[PDB]
C-alpha cells in the first residue's frame, strides 16, 4: 500500500545522514 | 530455394511489376498522338522494359517476396554470373590499371625530373606501359616470386617508436 | 501521493535556493587570492 | 574572357530555346503549358526526366523565366 | 612561462632569433658548428608560444623546441 | 678524415630524421675539431618544411 | 607543336580526354547492352 | 597563491578565466597533480571508487523511492498489459492547465512521467509486488550507500590506508573477485530466485518473516545432497501458467526448458535460476586458479613469460607484460573499458531478442529505449578504452622493459595495421555507398527491378544452423538427422525451436538485402572508428610530422603552423575525431534496430523489406514518416503528452548546432572580440565601477574542441531519444 | 655596457589618439616605453592601428605589450634604418631596460653572453616519460 509520512521522514533522515557522510568523504578526499 | 527465393519466371510479384510498369507507360502514352516523337519514345521505353524483364527471367534470377531479383554471392554454381564472373572481370581490369600505373612510376623514377613526368605524362611511354597490362597477373606473380615486387623493410622510412 | 505539498516545497529549494547557495559559495571560493 | 564565356552561355540558352524547347506551343497556350528547354537522352532510364510539360513536348521543366522574357521581347 | 630549449643540432643560422616577436632568443658563442654560435633562450618568461622560431629552423627536426605551459599574463598576450 | 667521402651515397640512421632509412649524397664534411654534425647530406625529396639537406654525424650514417 | 603536345599531355587535359573516352564507351555499351544485372555466360 | 586549482600551481597563477575552466576539467587526473605520490594516488582512487559506488546505490534507491511514492506499481502489477508505468510526479510551476491535464496518465491524480526504463518489469520479475517492498529496498540501499561512504572515509585514515603493494596484489584480487564478487554473488542471486522470485511468480508470498518457514521445494535439500538433482526439474510450469498466479504453476525450481514463457514472452525464472547456479559454480571454481598465500595456484607473470612461440614470430612473446600491466593503471582501465563495452553491446543485443523480464517484450518503447541506451553507453565505453590505451602509450609505456614483446611488435608494424584498416574502411564505404546510390537511382528512375539486392546468405545459413526453417538450408538443428539436433532434442530444443520459429518475436528476425547493406554499413562504421582510435593510440608517442609527441603529453592543441600545419596532431584529437564516427555508427545501429522493430511490431515488415535497400526509403518511410506525431506535440490548435518530446527534439537540434559553432570557428575571432568587449566595459560609465578579477579570454583550442564535442553529443542523444520515445509511444506500434 | 636611463623629457610622436592604447593593465600591472632617434619628420604606422609623425630627433612612445614594441622596432629598423630601445615600466616607477640587454641586437653573436636552455644532445635523444614517472620534472629538463 501507499507509504506513510513516518516512512517519508525516515527516508529524509536517512538521506540527511548519507549527505553528512558524503560531505565527510568529500572533505577527506580534498586534503 | 537458396534462402526461400522463387525463380523470377514463376514469381507472381515479378509479373505484377511487369504489368504495373507497362500500364504506367501506356497511361503516359494515352495523352500523345500515335505519330508523335514522344509516343515513339514511350513505345521504345515499353519495348526496353519488356526485353529487360524477359532477360531477367531467362537467366534464372531469384525473386524474393514480391518481385525483386536477389543476388547470391556464396559461390553457388547456378549463380556464378552474378558476382564471381563479373567479380573476376573487375579484378582483371583493376589489376590492369594498378599494375600499369606502378610500371609507369617505376619507369619514371629513373628519369632526371620524375615530378615533371608525373604532372606531364609521357604519353608514348605511358601507352607502351599500358599495352603491357594484358598479361598483368603473370608479371605480378613473376615479380612476387623473384622478389622485385615488395620492398625490403630496411629501405622504407618509418617514424620513431 | 502521500504528501502533495512536499514536491511544492522541495522543487523550489533544489531549483532556486540550492543553486544560489552553491554558485555563491563556489564563486567566493574560486575568487580567493590566498 | 568572362564576357566571351557569358556570351557563349546566352547563345546556348537561345539555341536550346530554338531547338530543344516548346516555346511556340507555350506561346499558343502560356497558362497550361509548362516551359521546357532541356531534353535528356534515353540511356540509363534517365528518360523518365522528360516529363509531360504540355504542347506535345517532353523535357525538363525550366524555371529561368526565359520564355516570359522572350514573350516580352516580341519573339 | 613556456619552456624553450636549444639542441646541439643547431647550425647558428640565427633565423629563429629574427622570427621571435617578443625577443626571447639570442645568439651566443659556441664551438659545435661552422658558424661558431648557438641559439639560447635566457628570457623565456616573455615567450608567448607562437613557435615562429620553430617554423624558421632549417634542421631536419627542430634544434629549437617550445613546450608551452603555465600561461601567465605575458604568455597570454593580454593588453588588459 | 672524419666521415664518408664527398659525393658518396649514405643511408641515415637518425630515427627522428625525415629521411630515416633513406639514401642521400654527401656534399661536404668539416674537419674542424669540435663540430658535432659535420657531414652534409643532400636528399632527392624534401621534408615537410621544404628542406632537402641536413647535417649528420658520421656514426649515424652508413655506406649504402 | 612541342609545347602544344606538352600541354595536352598535362594531367588535367589527359584526365579529361581519358575519362571522356571511358564515359563514351560505357554510355555506348549501355546503349547496345542495357539494364543487365547478371553477366550472361 | 593556492587558488581554486590547489592541485596545480600553474593554473592557480593563471590570471584569466582559463584557470577556472582547467581546474574544473583536470580535477580527476590525479597523476598530473603536483606533489603526487603513487601511494596517495592509489588511495585517492580507492576512495573515489567508494564514492562512485555510493552514488550508484543512491541513484537506484531514489528510483525505488520515487516508484514507491508516486508510481502505480501495484496497479501495473494487477494489470501489466494495459497499465502504463509511472516514473515520478511532475511539479512544474510553469505548466498551464492543458499541460497539467495532458500529463495526467497512469491513473494518477496529477501530472506524471511514464517510465521507459523497464524497472517495473524487472522488479515484478524478481518478486517485488507492493510499494512497501520498494520502500524497504530503497531504505536498504540508502544504508548500503552510507556504509560505502563510511568505508571510503575509513580507508583514507592513517591507520586504515592500504599500501601500494596491497593495491598491486593481482592474484589475490582476481581470486577474490572471481570467487566471491562474481561466483558467490551469482550463487546468492540464484538463491533469491529459488526462495523468493519463483514462489512469487507461482502465487506464494515469501518474505523475511517466513524465509526459514517457506519451503522452496517439497523435497528440500534431500535430493541435492543425495546427488539426484533431477528431482528439482520433474514438474516444470505448464504453458497455461499465469505469472504470479498459482493456476498452471509447477514445483520445479531448476528447469532447463529454454525458449520463452508463453504468457509473458520472457525467459523462464527457473531457467535463469539454473543459469546463475551454473555460472556461480564455474566462477567459484575459476577463482581458485592463482597463488595467493597457500603454495598452490599460478604465477601470472610466469604464465606470461612461458607463453612465447619458439619460432620467434611473436618475438619475445609476453615477457615483461606482467609488470607493464600491473604498474600502469591506464592499461588496466583500457582493458576494463574494452571488456565492459563488449559486454554492454552483448547486453543490448541479448535483452531485446531474449527478454528476461515479464511483460517486457510487449513494452515496445521500453525495449527500444533500453537497446539505444546500452548501445550508446557501449560506444562511449569503447572510445574511452582506446583513449586510455593512447594515454598508456604516452605516459606509462617503457620501451626498455617492453623490448621485442607483443606491444613492441605492434608499435613496429603499426603502419601496416593502419594502412589495412584504411583499406578495409575505404572498400566498405565505397561499395556500400555505391550500392545504396545505385538503388536510389534505380528507384528514382522507376525501375526497382534493376537494384543490386544481395541476399545475406551467410547469416541466413547461421540462422538455419540455429534452427530457423524459413530458409530451407536444413543443417545443424534445421535437420532431423544432424547429431546436434539429436543431442539437443531432449533438453532445450522443444522450447528453443518453438521460440526461433515464431516470427512474432525478435529472436533471430528474418533478414534480407537491406539487412545486408546495413550490416555492411555497421562494419564500415566499426572499422573506421577503430582506424581513427588505433591510429591515435599507435601514433601517440610520435610520427614523422611530430617525432617527439610523447614529451608534449596526451592533449595538446597543435605544434604550430610550421611543417605545413599541425592541427589535431595529438592522440586526444584522434579521440575527438573518433567520437563523431562512433556517434554515427551507433546512430546507424539504432536506426536499423528501431525501423526493423517498428515494421515488426506494426505487422507490416514489407515496408522495411522494400524500402531499406535505398536511402530515400530511410529518409521518408522512417525519419519523415515516424516524426509526424513527434512534431505535433504542441501546435497552434493545442498540445498533448508528446509536447515534452517535441520540445526536447528541438532542444537537441539547437544543442547540435551550438556544437557546430564551437567546432567550426576556432579561437582567434573570439579572442579579438573579447579584447574589444574588454575595452568597451572599461570605457563605459556606471559599469567600469564593476571590475572582473579574472581577465576574460577566449576558450582554448582543446577546450573549444571538447565543448563542441559535448554540445554535439548532447544534441545527438537528446534529439534521437526524443524521436525514439515519441515515435514508439505515440503509436504503440 | 651601461644600460641607458629613461629620460622623462623626450617628446612623443604626433598622434591624434586611438582606442588601441594603454588600459587598466598599464596602471595596475605594467606597460612599456620605446625610444628611438629619427633624422626627420616622417609618417610611420602605429602598431595599435593608425598613423603618426615621428619627431625629428628623440621619440618616446608608450605601449601595452612587448610584442607591439618589437613590431614597431622591427619596422623602424628594416624601413627607416633607426636604432631603438624600449623599457618595461611598473606602476611603482621601476624601469627595466629590455631589448638590447648588452647593447648589441640578439641577431648578432656577442661575447659575454651565457648559454641558457642549450641542451648538449639531439632532440630525439630525450628520456621517455615512463622512466620519469612520479618525478616532478620533464624529459627536456634533463
Ligand atoms: C540594346 C537594345 C536592344 C536589344 C537588346 C535588342 C534585342 C533584340 N532585338 Mg531589337 N531593336 C533595337 C534595340 C535592341 N534590340 C533598336 C534600337 C531597334 C530599332 C528601332 C530594334 C529593332 C528590332 C527589330 C525590327 C527586330 C529586333 C529583334 C531583336 C532580337 C534579336 C534577334 C536577332 O536577329 O539578333 C541577331 C541579329 C543581329 C543583327 C545581332 C548579331 C550580330 C550580327 C552578326 C552583326 C555583327 C556585326 C556588328 C557590326 C558587330 C558589332 C559589334 C561591335 C563593334 C559594336 C532581340 C530580342 C528581332 C526580333 O527577334 O524581334 C522580336 C526583330 O525582328 N529588334
Ligand atoms: C539520485 C537520486 C534521485 C534523483 C535523481 C531524484 C530526483 C527527484 N526527486 Mg527524489 N529522492 C531521492 C533520490 C532521488 N530523487 C531519495 C533517496 C529520497 C529520499 C529522501 C528522495 C525524496 C524526494 C522527495 C521527498 C521529493 C523528491 C523530489 C524529486 C524531484 C525534484 C528534485 C528534488 O526536490 O529533490 C529532493 C531530493 C531529496 C530531498 C533527496 C536527497 C537527494 C538524493 C539523496 C540524491 C543526492 C545525491 C545524488 C547522487 C546527486 C549527486 C549530484 C550530482 C553529482 C549528480 C526529482 C524528480 C520532489 C518531487 O517529487 O517533486 C515532484 C520531492 O518532493 N525526492
Ligand atoms: C554554354 C552553355 C550550354 C550548355 C550548358 C549546354 C548543354 C547541353 N547542350 Mg547545348 N549548345 C550550346 C551551349 C550549351 N549547351 C551552344 C552555344 C550550342 C551551339 C553550338 C549548343 C548546341 C547544342 C546541340 C546541337 C545539342 C546540345 C545538347 C546539349 C546537352 C548535351 C551536351 C552534349 O551533347 O555533349 C555531349 C558530349 C560531348 C560533345 C563531349 C565529347 C568530348 C569528350 C571529351 C569525349 C572525347 C573522347 C575522345 C577524345 C574522342 C546539354 C544539356 C544536345 C542535346 O540537348 O540533345 C538533346 C544537342 O543535340 N547543344
Ligand atoms: C552568375 C550570375 C548570374 C546568372 C547566371 C543570372 C541568371 C539570370 N538572371 Mg540575373 N543578375 C545577376 C547575376 C546572374 N543572373 C546580377 C549580378 C545582377 C545584377 C546586375 C542580375 C540582374 C538581373 C536582372 C535585373 C534580370 C536577371 C535575369 C536573369 C535570367 C537571365 C535571362 C536573360 O538573359 O535576361 C538578361 C537580363 C535582361 C534582359 C534584363 C536585365 C536588365 C538590367 C537592368 C540591365 C543590366 C545593366 C548593367 C549592365 C548591369 C550593371 C549595373 C551597374 C553598373 C550599376 C537568369 C535567371 C532576368 C530575369 O529574371 O528574366 C526572367 C532579369 O530581368 N538578372
Ligand atoms: C560500386 C557500386 C556499384 C556497382 C557494383 C554497380 C554495378 C552496376 N550498375 Mg550501378 N551505379 C553506381 C554504383 C555501382 N553500380 C552509382 C554510384 C551510380 C550512380 C551514378 C550508379 C548508377 C547506375 C545506373 C543508372 C545504371 C547502373 C547499372 C549498373 C550495372 C551495369 C553497368 C554497366 O555498364 O554494365 C555494362 C557492362 C560493362 C560496361 C562491362 C565492362 C566492359 C569493360 C570494357 C571490359 C571489357 C572486357 C574485358 C577487357 C575482358 C574481360 C573478360 C571477358 C571474358 C569478359 C551493374 C550491375 C546499369 C544497369 O544495367 O543496371 C542494372 C544502369 O542502368 N548503375
Ligand atoms: C551509465 C551507466 C548505466 C546506466 C545509467 C544504466 C541504466 C540501466 N541499466 Mg544498464 N548497464 C551498464 C550501464 C548502465 N546502465 C553497463 C556498463 C552494463 C554492463 C555490465 C549494464 C548492464 C545492464 C543489464 C544486464 C541490465 C541493465 C539494466 C538497466 C536499467 C535498470 C537500472 C539499473 O541498472 O539498476 C541499478 C541497480 C543497481 C545499482 C544494483 C546492482 C547491484 C547488484 C544487484 C549487486 C548484486 C551483488 C550482491 C550485493 C551480492 C550479495 C552478497 C551476499 C549476500 C552474497 C537501467 C535502464 C537492467 C534493465 O534493463 O532492466 C529493465 C538489466 O537487466 N544494465
Ligand atoms: C547463498 C544462497 C543461498 C542461501 C543463503 C540459502 C539459504 C537457505 N536455503 Mg536455499 N537454495 C539456494 C541458495 C541459497 N539458499 C540454491 C542455489 C538452491 C538451489 C539448489 C537452493 C535450494 C534450497 C532448497 C530446496 C531448500 C533451501 C533451504 C534453505 C535454508 C536452509 C536452512 C537449513 O540449514 O535447514 C536457508 C534459508 C531449505 C529450507 O528453506 O528449509 C526450510 C530447503 O528446503 N534452499
Ligand atoms: C572507468 C571509467 C573511467 C575512468 C576511471 C576515467 C578516468 C580518467 N580519464 Mg577517462 N574516459 C572514460 C572513462 C573513464 N575515465 C570514457 C568512457 C571515455 C570516453 C568518453 C574517456 C575519455 C577520456 C579522455 C579523452 C581523457 C580521459 C582522461 C581521464 C583522466 C582525467 C579525467 C578528468 O580530468 O576528469 C574531469 C572530468 C571531465 C573533464 C568531464 C567533464 C564533463 C564531460 C565533458 C561531459 C559533460 C556532458 C554534459 C555537459 C553534461 C550533461 C548535460 C545535460 C544537459 C545533458 C582520469 C584518469 C583524461 C586524461 O587522462 O588526461 C591525460 C583525457 O584526456 N578519459
Ligand atoms: C557523409 C559524410 C562523410 C563521408 C562520406 C565521409 C567519408 C570518409 N571519411 Mg570522413 N568524416 C565525416 C563525414 C564523412 N566522411 C565527419 C562528419 C567526421 C567527423 C569530423 C569525419 C571524420 C573522419 C575521420 C577522422 C576519418 C574519416 C574517414 C573517412 C573515409 C572512410 C572510408 C570510406 O567510407 O571510404 C569511401 C569513401 C567515401 C564514402 C567518400 C566519398 C566518395 C565519393 C562519393 C566518390 C567520388 C564521387 C565523384 C567522382 C566526385 C565528384 C566531384 C567532382 C570530381 C565533380 C571516407 C573518405 C577516415 C579515412 O580517411 O580513412 C581512410 C578517417 O580517418 N572521416
Ligand atoms: C589500444 C590498446 C588498448 C585498448 C585496446 C582495445 C580497446 C582493444 C579492444 C579489443 C576488442 C573489443 C576485442 C574483441 C574481440 C572479440 C573476439 C576475439 C571474439 C571472439 C569470438 C569467439 C571466439 C566466438 C566463439 C563462438 C561463437 C562464434 C559463437 C558461438 C559460441 C562460440 C564460443 C563457439 C589497451 C588499453 C589494451 C593497451 C594498449 C593497446
Ligand atoms: S635554432 Fe634553428 S633557427 Fe635558431 S639558430 Fe639554431 S639552427 Fe638556426
UniProtKB/Swiss-Prot annotation, chain D:
Chain segments annotated as transmembrane: 1-18
Coiled coil region boundaries: none
Signal peptide: none
Compartments, record wording: Plastid, Chloroplast thylakoid membrane
Functional description taken from the UniProt entry: PsaA and PsaB bind P700, the primary electron donor of photosystem I (PSI), as well as the electron acceptors A0, A1 and FX. PSI is a plastocyanin-ferredoxin oxidoreductase, converting photonic excitation into a charge separation, which transfers an electron from the donor P700 chlorophyll pair to the spectroscopically characterized acceptors A0, A1, FX, FA and FB in turn. Oxidized P700 is reduced on the lumenal side of the thylakoid membrane by plastocyanin.
Similarity-based family: Belongs to the PsaA/PsaB family.
Subunit comment: The PsaA/B heterodimer binds the P700 chlorophyll special pair and subsequent electron acceptors. PSI consists of a core antenna complex that captures photons, and an electron transfer chain that converts photonic excitation into a charge separation. The eukaryotic PSI reaction center is composed of at least 11 subunits.
Protein name from the UniProt record: Photosystem I P700 chlorophyll a apoprotein A1
Name of encoding gene: psaA
Residues of the whole record sequence present: 76 to 150 of 750
UniProtKB/Swiss-Prot annotation, chain E:
Protein species of origin: Physcomitrium patens (Spreading-leaved earth moss)
Gene label: psaC
Compartments where located: Plastid, Chloroplast thylakoid membrane
Name recorded for this polypeptide: Photosystem I iron-sulfur center
Span of domain 4Fe-4S ferredoxin-type: 1-30, 38-67
One GO term of the biological process aspect: photosynthesis
Binding site for [4Fe-4S] cluster 2: 20, 47, 50, 53
Cofactor(s) named in the record: [4Fe-4S] cluster
Alphabetically ordered keywords of this record: 4Fe-4S, Chloroplast, Electron transport, Iron, Iron-sulfur, Membrane, Metal-binding, Oxidoreductase, Photosynthesis, Photosystem I, Plastid, Repeat, Thylakoid, Transport
From Swiss-Prot, chain G:
Primary site of residence: plastid
Keywords: Chloroplast, Membrane, Photosynthesis, Photosystem I, Plastid, Thylakoid, Transmembrane, Transmembrane helix
Membrane topology recorded in Swiss-Prot or TrEMBL: Single-pass membrane protein
GO cellular component: chloroplast thylakoid membrane; photosystem I
InterPro entries found in the cross-reference section: PSI_PsaJ (IPR002615), PSI_PsaJ_sf (IPR036062)
Subcellular location(s) of the protein: Plastid, Chloroplast thylakoid membrane
Pfam families assigned to the protein according to its UniProt record, in alphabetical order: PSI_PsaJ
Segments passing through the bilayer: 7-27
UniProt KW Cell division keyword: no
GO biological process, one term: photosynthesis
Gene3D superfamilies, per database record: Single helix bin
HAMAP family named among the record's database cross-references: PSI_PsaJ
Function (record text): May help in the organization of the PsaE and PsaF subunits.
Family of this protein: Belongs to the PsaJ family.
Name assigned to this protein: Photosystem I reaction center subunit IX
UniProtKB/Swiss-Prot annotation, chain H:
Localization terms from the record: Plastid, Chloroplast thylakoid membrane
InterPro entries per UniProt: PSI_PsaA/B, PSI_PsaA/B_CS, PSI_PsaA/B_sf, PSI_PsaB
Cofactor note as given: P700 is a chlorophyll a/chlorophyll a' dimer, A0 is one or more chlorophyll a, A1 is one or both phylloquinones and FX is a shared 4Fe-4S iron-sulfur center.
Membrane topology field: Multi-pass membrane protein
Residue positions binding chlorophyll a B1: 653
Entry keyword set: 4Fe-4S, Chlorophyll, Chloroplast, Chromophore, Electron transport, Iron, Iron-sulfur, Magnesium, Membrane, Metal-binding, Oxidoreductase, Photosynthesis, Photosystem I, Plastid, Thylakoid, Transmembrane, Transmembrane helix, Transport
GO terms for cellular component: chloroplast thylakoid membrane; photosystem I
Domain of life from the UniProt record: Eukaryota
Residues reported in the UniProt entry to bind chlorophyll a B3: 661, 669
One annotated GO molecular function: 4 iron, 4 sulfur cluster binding
Keyword Glycosyltransferase part of the UniProt annotation: no
GO annotation terms (biological process): photosynthesis
Pfam families (alphabetical): PsaA_PsaB (PF00223)
Subunit structure: The PsaA/B heterodimer binds the P700 chlorophyll special pair and subsequent electron acceptors. PSI consists of a core antenna complex that captures photons, and an electron transfer chain that converts photonic excitation into a charge separation. The eukaryotic PSI reaction center is composed of at least 11 subunits.
Protein name: Photosystem I P700 chlorophyll a apoprotein A2
Gene expressing this chain: psaB
